[PDB]
Design a binder for this molecule. Structure first.
Ligand SMILES: [Cl-]
Ligand SMILES: [Cl-]
Ligand SMILES: [Cl-]
Ligand SMILES: [Cl-]
Ligand SMILES: [Cl-]
Ligand SMILES: [Cl-]
Ligand SMILES: [Cl-]
Ligand SMILES: [Cl-]
Ligand SMILES: [Cl-]
Ligand SMILES: [Cl-]
Ligand SMILES: [Cl-]
Ligand SMILES: [Cl-]
Ligand SMILES: [Cl-]
Ligand SMILES: [Cl-]
Ligand SMILES: [Cl-]
Ligand SMILES: [Cl-]
Ligand SMILES: [Cl-]
Ligand SMILES: [K+]
Ligand SMILES: [Mg+2]
Ligand SMILES: [Mg+2]
Lengths: 233, 248, 230, 204, 239, 234, 237, 244
């Protein structure tokens, strides 16, 4: 036993490495960025028929132009999601403009290494966040997808998977993605890929899907809109 | 410093809190202390550990503490820890009285102390208090009451109980003799002596070795008294006369 | 900063071993005795006084807290000085509020409470001393012991430090309720002679007394006088 | 004046082996009477009372905060508080607020719980104590009160004579004061009993 | 083990963490100071670990007040932090008392700061030793040296780092009490060249500074032309 | 071993293993190069891309009109330090109405980054920086380390396989002072290219460039903007 | 003040304190919740029995507000802290919104409290799970569950505590539109679910109901053993 | 018991199973690391401190090598043990004395200054996070009623006034020598106080000093200000001794 801010001989923070491993215990989520908008899709991972599926929320609205998909230790994600929400509203308040997807992601990622047990306030963070996040949205740069992990590293991706089957899903993504792909194509592709990787049979209640498009605000797919897409797949 | 921190406020692998358990072992070795609820009152009876010949006898008891007008307690475990907690009980009871201008209801005082005990098991890195308490009282909501708390910050109400040395045996004898809804202070007193007589099996029971307090109501006022040695010997006498009847 | 965790904790068997171990430092300390007579209290202690080079008068083990209360100890001297200082401060705090000297028992309770803190509070060990505290108030003598746990006890007579078990049985077979203070001083000094080693002089024991007139150390010359008989 | 916002009067008086404490009963706000049974004298022991005149809110706060402290004292200490000690406790409570004081000037009356010796005192609003062997007065008619006490009080009075003297001192004093009265209550404290009386008094 | 914290004595009464910090100074290349008739001269064997570095990079000689130089060995980040402490102490002294801090007092103050890092598990000892030099008409030339334990002494000559002993033995040959700063700089350079191990560590820069009558009591770098002449004298003297 | 978990624990050889371990975070970063002429200071960085569909991590950051950085190691520590530098620069323009001299800013980095190496429960910064700047003393390249040491450089490379880049830079460094800007950036690119596996090449997707000098505020070139510099590596 | 990091990651992404907190919950008395059509029911085992106990003083079902209650399993002292914190929060909500909390709002608050005690220095996690029930302003009935991690979900029915696995299995098979058509059957479903695991059935099931607008009613032993006989004589047939 | 150990009782100041404080014991060993011995003696007219002065290195400015320190005008001290610790303790003593005079309007008594430093040292024996100071302080001054004073305090926080005492490597042997000499003397009191101190030191070290190898500090009833003897002054004592 050693402190939470101890480096390994390889130059990595043990706690951060260990937090990255917790992401592998999450359900799979996928993001794809097209010139017509971004989609976010996530495996719900229902553990009992008695559980209400709509109470699993692994895709959330950050603001009208920005959604977020999470995988890993979901309870940890709450303060991150709330920070993103507060930050975009502060930016609107101060600057009367929407905050960029990149900027939001940056703000949240600045929390990542703020843990430790003798710099900080009487009960500050004791450990990093066991969560990875995909921020998908539209700003003046156009549609955009960004990934962030517990190291606070963040980067734009054209398509990305996270969670348990991300290897796998990321391969199928390299295979199907192309820069001129339509949003409808990307939606089909991410449901086809979820369908491969999911232990359970895919259906309209054990996945979620959302989009954001230059036209149109953050939109969570209804049961009925999922059922329509699921027919081809 | 992480090397020296014995980590008093963490879970063990089975979801246990070792300090709390260990503190409970300290209590089980302390002086036996019982509480018995009756229709007309409530009592505490405790084994004295302050029994050497050269001791001086200066307070009105060893382990019975007045908390406010309507309540008292006894304790089993680390004495100095008990002094901290009983001081805190008195403070809580005056805070209430200041604020509401009525006596703190019994269960509310117990729960307030128990929340302090609980905190000590959850944060702050300190050893818990090594004290279990029995609380006797009257309030206008539930009348005569008896409560028990332990170092986990857990508590419960009882019609009769025991903490400290030979607790398990004492509770068995209570289970068997206690008449729910039909006890008087006089018969609770007899029973208390019967129980201590069995559970102080090191050795032959004597007034110098026990302390008894009663809590009754007289003319709309709570009366809390520690029995004098004359009365304690009389009850011991009566119990010894009673066991002479036991066969024929 | 300060360590914020307790250094005293429960062992599996329910023991606070740091407090036991503090009691072992007390037991290895120099002997102290207190006897409560009918009309007063005597405190007496052996000086662990090596060398003729020591100026015996330069530090005292028997100390005044107030005009009417005094203390002695067995165990670690420097720990005792802490408690003497706090006891004095406690007594004055009481006097400022109530305008009456602190009753002996109240003083013992507040000092004992400090000792309890050092068994739980963060980054500290318990005090390695036991105190004998004498006083006179409500027209009557008091003798108390306060131990490293913060437990206290009222005694008619007792002994602490090296060879205390024997000292206690020596006093059992010697104290009576109706004993006078001057006789009590004699029996206190005899109790020290039971475990002395070295030949007693007025310079290697220290004696304090407490009665209606107040608490004071006996002077070397007064001790010399009691020593002629012994 | 803050001290006259509510009006009111208290006094205490020593007799042989007994003491007396009295108060008017009006609670009013400037000219307006609100009630006529407002308590100003509070038990602090079986044979020890405290009377408070001044701003009604502080009368109640001081009585309550004092009781808090006293109850803790008595639980910790063996025993019932001595009169002189109560005075000191009250002094210390009032002087903590030296720079934002409670607007009350108490009188204390009692018998020592062991010796039954009579004690009376008063304090100013920042806790300066004053013990006397005759009487003390506090309130919006203190001059009137002094004039009655100086003229009527004698030493070594029996309980009946003490009751008449303190009663006549209060009634006649408050009847020269617009904002005190609406009734008088008197407690006579003796070794073996407390006698509590309300007086026939002007109600204007 | 007894060697993990500066708040733990070993059974023989040592504080190994302070000893380990001293080992860091002892691994460093050598710095020397010499007090003479009219001032103090400092020299450092400044190992050049890459040819990619600028001349002057990683200076080991600092101005801590206008009259006070500091020469360091050991972990350089710790030394720089100490130079900041020294600077702040000299600045605060001037603000409070209204005159230039006397060398000895400055040495004693910074030494107590170093000392404070030798008592606690909360912090570690500084991995550096350093010399302070000054000159004034009133106080003369003064040279002090402070080590990781916080001990502070004054010297005629001093050396710190890995060839300390070899340096001292060369310094002992000078009658420095009767020499001037201008004569001593050459001898400083000479001694750095003597103790330098040209086989084991390949490239060094000589760093030189001084404070004395000739600089009017200001601590200054030795001018370039005088340093080069001193190097040339040291190099030829090695022959 | 008992000596490697706390930045406050000296080893018996006079080393601090936590600081050495922090330096490994920089050695494992992607390589970056910094070099200068008489008139300009240039940074060149290789961007590592997580997947084939990821953008490539930012390596080069704006600090002030006259200062930019290249990073290697923990990106979150890089941002924390970069934000410190930014703030120090703003403070100086607010107070003095002039740019913060580059060597002073680097001093402030040394002092700031040393502090946690000496306190229990803190850790070093796990990042190394190359700092390009231009002030009254001309162009600069500085290097900062997790040890809190820093260096003033003719040129430098840190990160994975940077030894190769350092060798190239030593080989050609006598040419740098007199180089025009195109020449100097070409040199930076050739040095960076030595760090690559022999198959692979510099592309507009993997190279980022930062330039400041006498005529030119700190400017970042990415993606299509690096092509002019990449063509005529002739 | 004590700032030790208590909950930390281990290799493979475990949070051992949290896993140990979950072990505490698994040794608690079984608790079961079912969401009816227009009723919600909570039932809980035992815990000790003991004739000399004052039963009123150890209930494991607790009102949070007029329209929300909860049961818990695990460390009972920890539960009391969570319950009091939630009770305070229900009064802030009413203060600042002038509506009662939704069940989801207070659940989300409790879960977030629990999550914070897994990521703050100087503290261990709460060793409890809770089943939180009531109705929303618009009449919709609700059952949520929280655990030591701070995770929460809504359920049709669920069990926590010792024997949760088998009680949950039983509910999965027995929760149908038919079993919850009425009030009595909803209640009888909860009792059947307990009566599977409950040592000396039963005897020591404590049970409570909440109707739309009607506030928490706890059943008494007389009303409980009515349902017990009414289910046991049906299982002979 | 007999040297037993549990848990961390050799690393921090917690009790061992016999009730010892090993860390405190180890601080006493640290006092000897320095290799030096100090002696202090008091008579009716004066008090004296003598210590070894070892200047192994020629390159030291020997005027800066001392273990004698002025605390106030009227209080002097000799420090034995770890040097930087000693200096810290000297600073604290200077602060305590100055503070006392500012608050109380008269000079701190030597006994009170010694008690204060010892009380501060006590805290290091009870709190776990810092070590004791591995040094020992001997104070001299004139008290207006009691005459010349010698006081000593140690890393356990013990303190005492003395007729004579010693510290460091040869403390035990010094103590033996001084005891043997006072018993001989009428009313158990030293009269030739500077000679006793130097003689004690010379015997227990077997050296026969040069005047540059010891330092001597004094306070006298006629001249209470603490004074450090010059080399020539010390030489006069060395020569007066050598000639009988
Ligand atoms: Cl992943
Ligand atoms: Cl009360
Ligand atoms: Cl009450
Ligand atoms: Cl801590
Ligand atoms: Cl004191
Ligand atoms: Cl007093
Ligand atoms: Cl005295
Ligand atoms: Cl108050
Ligand atoms: Cl060195
Ligand atoms: Cl990198
Ligand atoms: Cl990173
Ligand atoms: Cl470095
Ligand atoms: Cl590198
Ligand atoms: Cl909270
Ligand atoms: Cl469960
Ligand atoms: Cl002054
Ligand atoms: Cl002599
Ligand atoms: K210590
Ligand atoms: Mg009137
Ligand atoms: Mg009228």
């Amino acid at each position: 036993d050693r402190g939470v801010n101890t480096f390994s001989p390889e130059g990595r923070l043990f706690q951060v490495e260990y937090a990255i491993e917790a992401i592998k215990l999450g359900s799979t989520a996928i993001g794809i960025q097209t010139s017509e908008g971004v989609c976010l899709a996530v495996e719900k991972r229902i553990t009992s028929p008695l559980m209400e599926p709509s109470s699993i929320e692994k895709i959330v609205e950050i603001d009208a132009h920005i959604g977020c998909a999470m995988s890993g230790l979901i309870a940890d994600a709450k303060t991150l999601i709330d920070k993103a929400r507060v930050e975009t509203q502060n930016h609107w308040f101060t600057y009367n403009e929407t905050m960029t997807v990149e900027s939001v992601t940056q703000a949240v990622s600045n929390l990542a290494l703020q843990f430790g047990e003798e710099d900080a306030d009487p009960g500050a963070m004791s450990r990093p966040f066991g969560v990875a996040l995909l921020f998908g949205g539209v700003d003046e740069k156009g549609p955009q997808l960004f990934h962030m992990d517990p190291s606070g590293t963040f980067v734009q991706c054209d398509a990305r998977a996270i969670g348990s089957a991300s290897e796998g899903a990321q391969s199928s993504l390299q295979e199907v993605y192309h820069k001129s792909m339509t949003l409808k194509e990307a939606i089909k592709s991410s449901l086809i890929i979820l369908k491969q990787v999911m232990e359970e049979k895919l259906n309209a209640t054990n996945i979620e899907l959302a989009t954001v498009q230059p036209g149109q605000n953050f939109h969570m797919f209804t049961k009925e809109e999922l059922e329509e897409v699921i027919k081809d797949i | 410093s992480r090397r020296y921190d014995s980590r008093t406020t963490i879970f063990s692998p089975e979801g246990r809190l070792y300090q709390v358990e260990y503190a409970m072992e300290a209590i089980g070795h302390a002086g036996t202390c019982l509480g018995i609820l009756a229709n007309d009152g409530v009592l505490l009876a405790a084994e004295r550990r302050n029994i050497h010949k050269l001791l001086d006898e200066v307070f009105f008891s060893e382990k019975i503490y007045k908390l406010n007008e309507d309540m008292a307690c006894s304790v089993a475990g680390i004495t100095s820890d008990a002094n901290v907690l009983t001081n805190e009980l008195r403070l809580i009871a005056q805070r209430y009285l200041l604020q509401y201008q009525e006596p703190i209801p019994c269960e509310q005082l117990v729960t307030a102390l128990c929340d302090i005990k609980q905190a000590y098991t959850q944060f702050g890195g300190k050893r818990p208090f090594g004290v279990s308490l029995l609380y006797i009282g009257w309030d206008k909501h539930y009348g005569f009451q008896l409560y028990q708390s332990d170092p986990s910050g857990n508590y419960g109400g009882w019609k009769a109980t025991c903490i400290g040395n030979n607790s398990a045996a004492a509770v068995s004898m209570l289970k068997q003799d206690y008449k729910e809804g039909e006890m008087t202070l006089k018969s609770a007193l007899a029973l208390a002596i019967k129980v201590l007589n069995k559970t102080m099996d090191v050795s032959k029971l004597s007034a110098e070795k026990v302390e008894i307090a009663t809590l009754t109501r007289e003319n709309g006022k709570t009366v809390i008294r520690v029995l004098k040695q004359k009365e304690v010997e009389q009850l011991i006498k009566k119990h010894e006369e009673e066991e002479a009847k036991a066969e024929r | 900063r300060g360590y914020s965790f307790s250094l005293t904790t429960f062992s599996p068997s329910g023991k606070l071993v740091q407090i036991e171990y503090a009691l072992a430092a007390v037991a290895g300390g120099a002997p102290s005795v207190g006897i409560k007579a009918a009309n007063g209290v005597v405190l007496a202690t052996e000086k662990k006084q090596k060398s003729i080079l020591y100026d015996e008068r330069s530090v005292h083990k028997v100390e005044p807290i107030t005009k009417h209360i005094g203390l002695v100890y067995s165990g670690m001297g420097p720990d005792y000085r802490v408690l003497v200082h706090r006891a004095r401060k406690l007594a004055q705090q009481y006097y400022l509020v109530y305008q009456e000297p602190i009753p002996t028992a109240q003083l013992v309770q507040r000092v004992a409470s400090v000792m309890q803190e050092y068994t739980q509070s963060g980054g500290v060990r318990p005090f390695g001393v036991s105190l004998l505290i004498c006083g006179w108030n409500e027209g009557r003598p008091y003798l108390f012991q306060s131990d490293p746990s913060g437990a206290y006890f009222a005694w008619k007579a007792t002994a602490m430090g090296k060879n205390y078990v024997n000292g206690k049985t020596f006093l059992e077979k010697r104290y009576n309720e109706d004993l006078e203070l001057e006789d009590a001083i004699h029996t206190a000094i005899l109790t020290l002679k039971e475990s002395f080693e070295g030949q007693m002089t007025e310079d290697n024991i220290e004696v304090g007394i407490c009665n209606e007139a107040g608490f004071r150390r006996l002077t070397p010359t007064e001790v010399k006088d009691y020593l002629a008989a012994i | 004046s803050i001290m006259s916002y509510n009006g009111g009067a208290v006094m205490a008086m020593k007799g042989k082996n007994c003491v007396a404490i009295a108060a008017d009963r009006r609670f009013g706000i400037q000219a307006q009477m609100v009630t006529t049974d407002f308590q100003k004298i509070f038990p602090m022991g079986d044979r020890l009372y405290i009377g408070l005149a001044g701003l009604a809110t502080d009368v109640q706060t001081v009585a309550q905060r004092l009781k808090f402290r006293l109850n803790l004292y008595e639980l910790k200490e063996g025993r019932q508080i001595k009169p002189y000690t109560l005075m000191s406790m009250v002094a210390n409570l009032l002087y903590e607020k030296r720079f934002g004081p409670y607007y009350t000037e108490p009188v204390i009356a009692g018998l020592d719980p062991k010796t039954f010796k009579p004690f009376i005192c008063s304090l100013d609003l920042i806790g300066c104590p004053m013990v006397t062997d005759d009487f003390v007065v506090s309130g919006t008619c203190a001059e009137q009160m002094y004039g009655m006490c100086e003229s009527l009080w004698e030493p070594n009075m029996d309980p009946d004579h003490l009751f008449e003297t303190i009663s006549q001192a209060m009634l006649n004093a408050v009847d020269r004061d617009a904002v005190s009265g609406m009734g008088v209550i008197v407690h006579i404290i003796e070794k073996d009993k407390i006698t509590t009386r309300t007086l026939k008094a002007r109600m204007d | 083990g007894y060697d993990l914290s500066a708040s733990t004595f070993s059974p023989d009464g040592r504080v190994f963490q302070v000893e380990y910090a001293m080992k860091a100074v002892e691994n460093s290349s050598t710095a020397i100071g010499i007090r003479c008739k009219d001032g103090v001269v400092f020299g450092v064997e400044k190992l050049v670990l890459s040819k990619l570095y600028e001349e002057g990079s990683n200076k080991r000689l600092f101005n801590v007040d206008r009259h006070v130089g500091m020469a360091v060995a050991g972990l350089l980040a710790d030394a720089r932090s100490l130079a900041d402490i020294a600077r702040e102490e000299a600045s605060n002294f001037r603000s409070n008392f209204g005159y230039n801090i006397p060398l000895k007092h400055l040495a004693d103050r910074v030494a107590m700061y170093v000392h404070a890092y030798t008592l606690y598990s909360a912090v570690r000892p500084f991995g550096c030793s350093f010399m302070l030099g000054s000159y004034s008409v009133n106080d003369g030339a003064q040279l002090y040296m402070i080590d990781p334990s916080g001990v502070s002494y004054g010297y005629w000559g001093c050396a710190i780092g890995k060839a300390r002993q070899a340096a001292k033995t060369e310094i002992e040959k000078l009658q420095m009490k009767e020499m001037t700063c201008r004569d001593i700089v050459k001898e400083v350079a000479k001694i750095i060249y003597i103790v330098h191990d040209e086989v084991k560590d390949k490239a060094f820069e000589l760093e030189l500074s001084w404070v004395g009558e000739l600089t009017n009591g200001r601590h200054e770098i030795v001018p370039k032309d005088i340093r080069e002449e001193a190097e040339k004298y040291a190099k030829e003297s090695l022959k | 071993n008992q000596y490697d978990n706390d930045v406050t624990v000296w080893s018996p050889q006079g080393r601090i293993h936590q600081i050495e371990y922090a330096m490994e975070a920089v050695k494992q970063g992607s390589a970056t190069v910094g070099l200068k002429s008489k008139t300009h200071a240039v940074l060149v960085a290789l961007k590592r891309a997580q997947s084939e569909l990821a953008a490539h991590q930012k390596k080069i950051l704006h600090v002030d009109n006259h200062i930019g950085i290249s990073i290697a190691g923990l990106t979150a520590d890089a941002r924390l330090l970069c934000n410190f530098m930014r703030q120090e620069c703003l403070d100086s323009r607010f107070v003095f109405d002039r740019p913060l001299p580059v060597s002073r800013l680097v001093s402030l980095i040394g002092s700031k980054t040393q502090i946690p190496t000496q306190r229990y429960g803190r850790r070093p910064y796990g990042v190394g920086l190359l700092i390009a700047g231009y002030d009254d003393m001309g162009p600069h390249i500085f290097q900062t380390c997790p040890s809190a040491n820093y260096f003033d450089c003719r040129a430098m490379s840190i990160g994975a396989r940077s030894q190769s880049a350092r060798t190239y830079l030593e080989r050609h460094m006598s040419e740098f002072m007199e180089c025009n800007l195109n020449e100097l950036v070409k040199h930076g690119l050739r040095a960076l290219r030595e760090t690559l596996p022999a198959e692979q090449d510099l592309t507009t997707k993997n190279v980022s460039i930062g330039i400041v000098g006498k005529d030119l505020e700190f400017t970042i070139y990415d993606d299509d903007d690096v092509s002019p510099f990449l063509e005529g590596l002739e | 003040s004590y700032d030790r990091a208590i909950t930390v990651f281990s290799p493979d992404g475990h949070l051992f304190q949290v896993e140990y907190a979950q072990e505490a919950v698994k040794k608690g008395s079984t608790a079961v919740g079912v969401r009816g059509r227009d009723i919600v029911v909570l039932g809980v085992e035992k815990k000790s029995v003991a004739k000399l106990q004052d039963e009123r003083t150890v209930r494991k079902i607790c009102a949070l507000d007029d329209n929300v209650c909860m049961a818990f399993a695990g460390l009972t002292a920890d539960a009391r802290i969570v319950i009091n914190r939630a009770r305070v929060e229900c009064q802030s909500h009413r203060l600042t919104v002038e509506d009662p909390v939704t069940v989801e709002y207070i659940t989300r608050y409790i879960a977030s409290l629990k999550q914070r005690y897994t990521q703050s220095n100087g503290r261990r996690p709460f060793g409890i799970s809770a089943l939180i029930v009531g109705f929303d302003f618009d009449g919709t009935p609700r059952l949520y569950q929280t655990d030591p991690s701070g995770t929460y979900h809504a359920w049709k029915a669920n069990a926590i505590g010792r024997g949760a696995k088998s009680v949950r299995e039983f509910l999965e098979k027995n929760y149908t539109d038919e079993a919850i058509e009425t009030d009595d059957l909803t209640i009888k479903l909860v009792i059947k679910a307990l009566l599977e695991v409950v040592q000396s059935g039963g005897k020591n099931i404590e049970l409570a109901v909440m109707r739309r607008d009607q506030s928490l009613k706890i059943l008494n032993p007389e009303e409980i053993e009515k349902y017990v006989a009414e289910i046991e004589k049906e299982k002979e047939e | 018991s007999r040297g037993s150990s549990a848990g961390f009782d050799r690393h921090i100041t917690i009790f061992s199973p016999e009730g010892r404080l090993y860390q405190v014991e180890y601080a006493f060993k640290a006092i000897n690391q320095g290799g030096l011995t100090s002696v202090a003696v008091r008579g009716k007219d004066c008090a004296v401190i003598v210590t070894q002065k070892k200047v192994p290195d020629k390159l030291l400015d020997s005027s800066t090598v001392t273990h004698l320190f002025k605390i106030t005008e009227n209080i002097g001290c000799v420090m034995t043990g770890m040097t930087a610790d000693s200096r810290s303790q000297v600073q604290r003593a200077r602060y305590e004395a100055a503070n006392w005079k500012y608050k109380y309007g008269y000079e701190i008594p030597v006994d009170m200054l010694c008690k204060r430093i010892a009380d501060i040292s006590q805290v290091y024996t009870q709190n776990a996070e810092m070590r004791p100071l591995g040094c020992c302080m001997i104070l001299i001054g004139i008290d207006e009623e009691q005459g010349p004073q010698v006081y000593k305090c140690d890393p356990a926080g013990y303190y005492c006034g003395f007729k004579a005492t010693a510290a460091g490597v040869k403390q035990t042997e010094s103590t033996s020598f001084l005891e043997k000499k006072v018993k001989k003397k009428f009313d158990w009191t030293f009269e030739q106080t500077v000679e006793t101190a130097i003689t004690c030191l010379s015997t227990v070290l077997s050296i026969d000093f040069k005047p540059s190898e010891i330092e001597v500090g004094v306070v006298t009833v006629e001249n209470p200000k603490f004074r450090i003897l010059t080399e020539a002054e010390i030489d006069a004592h060395l020569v007066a001794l050598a000639e009988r």
